[PDB]
Curated annotation (Swiss-Prot), chain A:
Function: Forms the portal vertex of the capsid. This portal plays critical roles in head assembly, genome packaging, neck/tail attachment, and genome ejection. The portal protein multimerizes as a single ring-shaped homododecamer arranged around a central channel. Binds to the terminase subunits to form the packaging machine. Acts as a linker between the capsid and tail. Required for attachment of the neck proteins to the capsid.
Factors inducing expression: Expressed in the late phase of the viral replicative cycle. Expression of late genes is activated by the viral late transcription activator C.
Subcellular location: Virion; Host cytoplasm
Protein name: Portal protein
Subunit structure: Homododecamer. Part of the immature prohead complex. Might interact with viral I protease; this interaction gives rise to an early 25S initiator complex. The scaffolding protein Z and the capsid protein T should then be added to this initiator complex to yield the immature prohead. Host GroEL and GroES are also essential for the correct assembly of viral head and tail.
Shown stretch of the complete protein: 3 to 74 of 512
Domain of life: Viruses
Intrachain S-S bonds: none
PTM statement from Swiss-Prot or TrEMBL: Cleavage by the viral I protease yields a C-terminally cleaved portal protein competent for DNA packaging and procpasid maturation.
From Swiss-Prot, chain B:
Biological source species: Escherichia phage Mu (Bacteriophage Mu)
Region of the whole protein represented: 72 to 140 of 141
Name this protein carries in UniProt: Gene product J
Domain of life the protein comes from: Viruses
Region feature (Disordered): 31-69
Phylogenetic lineage: Viruses, Duplodnaviria, Heunggongvirae, Uroviricota, Caudoviricetes
Subcellular location: Host cytoplasm
Reported phenotype of the disruption mutant: Accumulation of unattached tails and full heads.
Induction: Expressed in the late phase of the viral replicative cycle. Expression of late genes is activated by the viral late transcription activator C.
Length: 72, 69
């Protein structure tokens, strides 16, 4: 068994975690664009949700900002 | 009043014509909005009417009700 950096032994698997058949469904995603009609309440709600561990709407919003804004 | 004036078309008296003129003047005042027709005496209730004044605008972003910034 391969020893982890923390010192806890484990088993090494060469196959990716995303290659599992059950995980294949969640791999395909539709990239929504929440930057259409932005509202300060909407942005605040997205940030609040990302604080608790959502991390999805914030990621899509950041992707939209990095392409819509030329200076950024 | 106006029906009685309509009936007395062959020869109208001075008072009947004066009353009809006063009635039509009151009706024009009501139409122009310068006076209220009133409400029925049995219970306080005014007749329903359409919106005389109406404006349209897009939703107000950046208003002080946002409280998000």
């Amino acid at each position: 068994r391969i020893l982890d950096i923390s010192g806890q032994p484990f088993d090494f698997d060469d196959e990716m975690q995303s290659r599992s058949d059950e995980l294949a469904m969640v791999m395909k995603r539709t990239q929504e664009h929440p930057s259409s009609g932005v509202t300060p309440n909407r942005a605040a709600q997205m940030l609040r949700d990302a604080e608790r561990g959502d991390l999805t709407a914030q990621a899509d919003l950041a992707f939209d900002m990095e392409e819509k804004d030329t200076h950024l | 009043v106006v029906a009685w004036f309509y009936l007395n078309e062959s020869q109208p008296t001075e008072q009947i014509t004066a009353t009809y003129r006063d009635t039509v003047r009151w009706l024009e005042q009501v139409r122009d909005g310068k006076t209220d027709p009133g409400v029925e005496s049995r219970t306080a209730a005014s007749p329903e009417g359409e919106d005389l004044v109406q404006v349209q605008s897009d939703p107000p972003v950046f208003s002080r009700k946002q409280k998000g910034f």
